[PDB]
Amino acid sequence: GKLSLQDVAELIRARACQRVVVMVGAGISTPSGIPDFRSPGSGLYSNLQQYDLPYPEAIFELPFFFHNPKPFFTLAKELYPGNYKPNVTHYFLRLLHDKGLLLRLYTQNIDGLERVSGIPASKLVEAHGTFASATCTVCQRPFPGEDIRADVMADRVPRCPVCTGVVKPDIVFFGEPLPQRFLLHVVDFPMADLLLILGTSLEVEPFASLTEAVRSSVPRLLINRDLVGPLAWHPRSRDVAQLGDVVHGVESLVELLGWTEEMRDLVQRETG
Numbered sequence: 001g002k003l004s005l006q007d008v009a010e011l012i013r014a015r016a017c018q019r020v021v022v023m024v025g026a027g028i029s030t031p032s033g034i035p036d037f038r039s040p041g042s043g044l045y046s047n048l049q050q051y052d053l054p055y056p057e058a059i060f061e062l063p064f065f066f067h068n069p070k071p072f073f074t075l076a077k078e079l080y081p082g083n084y085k086p087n088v089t090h091y092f093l094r095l096l097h098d099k100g101l102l103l104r105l106y107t108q109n110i111d112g113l114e115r116v117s118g119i120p121a122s123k124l125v126e127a128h129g130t131f132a133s134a135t136c137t138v139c140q141r142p143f144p145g146e147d148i149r150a151d152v153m154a155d156r157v158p159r160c161p162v163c164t165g166v167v168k169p170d171i172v173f174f175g176e177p178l179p180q181r182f183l184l185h186v187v188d189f190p191m192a193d194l195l196l197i198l199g200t201s202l203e204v205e206p207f208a209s210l211t212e213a214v215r216s217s218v219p220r221l222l223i224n225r226d227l228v229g230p231l232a233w234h235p236r237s238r239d240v241a242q243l244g245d246v247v248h249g250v251e252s253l254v255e256l257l258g259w260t261e262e263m264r265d266l267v268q269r270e271t272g
């Protein structure tokens, strides 16, 4: 005996759920053309196995970075705003926002597509950082991301104007503290009246445990290829899994909401 996708739709449609917290990962940007991390074959971590890194995860490790920052900057150049557009997944979240129902959007992605899709900064927690800002690794001077863009685009490792130190984008590396705005989770998760989890394997903390931080009465909707994380191992009474392609799953929710025409209009106005 389980809730259905329609049940969740109808909670939203009626404004019974008005404080939706959303958690996303790299699966939401595969329909925009960006690989995820862990899909066999196409994921980034399967494909860095072939390069001169001790293991794929070294691309986000500081000792490796100091030894050779080139791989990380190759990734920065590709992900700096400009090459990808948000997809219907992102724009569903923007529609939810514009209807006044989004409490917060927590993202593990570094592609910046939530900001690109028009989610206001106050409504967004970029929990693994952003290319919007950068910090000198030597003197700790902060820079806007726009300052290093020309170097990044030019296949040049950006150096600090004062100390000549490598200027690193504010992407969270292993062992670094999460961003200040992550503090909001303390208030947002107890307040959420609905949790939506999209396109994440829930292999990595803190997002795996954050799925547990909503009240035990709160429905949790997973839209993902696979049943993962606490949703697989620690199910709750009001969980719902919409398994399969994320665009298909979102479009099925949208249809159940009666928002198809509005979604089509939004996507065409933003991306047509």
Ligand SMILES: Nc1ncnc2c1ncn2[C@@H]1O[C@H](COP(=O)(O)OP(=O)(O)OC[C@H]2O[C@H](O)[C@H](O)[C@@H]2O)[C@@H](O)[C@H]1O
Residues within 6 Å of the ligand: 024, 025, 026, 027, 028, 030, 031, 036, 037, 038, 039, 043, 108, 109, 128, 199, 200, 201, 202, 203, 204, 223, 224, 225, 226, 228, 244, 245, 246, 247
């Ligand atoms: N089109 C799609 N439709 C549905 N599900 C999809 C699709 N594409 C991929 N998936 C699912 O999307 C999920 C993608 O999982 P992962 O690749 O681990 O990404 P993360 O965001 O959770 O990685 C977390 C952190 O780990 C890193 O170290 C970085 O720090 C990351 O921020 C899988 O379950 C896919 O089956």
Ligand SMILES: O=C(O)COCCOCCOCCOCCOCCO
Residues within 6 Å of the ligand: 026, 029, 034, 035, 036, 037, 044, 048, 051, 052, 070, 071, 072, 074, 075, 078, 079, 108, 109, 110, 111, 112
């Ligand atoms: O949606 C996201 O935010 C999460 O997925 C980000 C995936 O990044 C793929 C972009 O990297 C492309 C450039 O290749 C890196 C080269 O590494 C050096 C290998 O030698």
Ligand code: NA
Residues within 6 Å of the ligand: 028, 029, 107, 109, 111, 112, 113, 114
């Ligand atoms: Na994204």
Ligand SMILES: [Zn+2]
Residues within 6 Å of the ligand: 136, 137, 138, 139, 140, 141, 160, 161, 162, 163, 164, 165
């Ligand atoms: Zn410096």
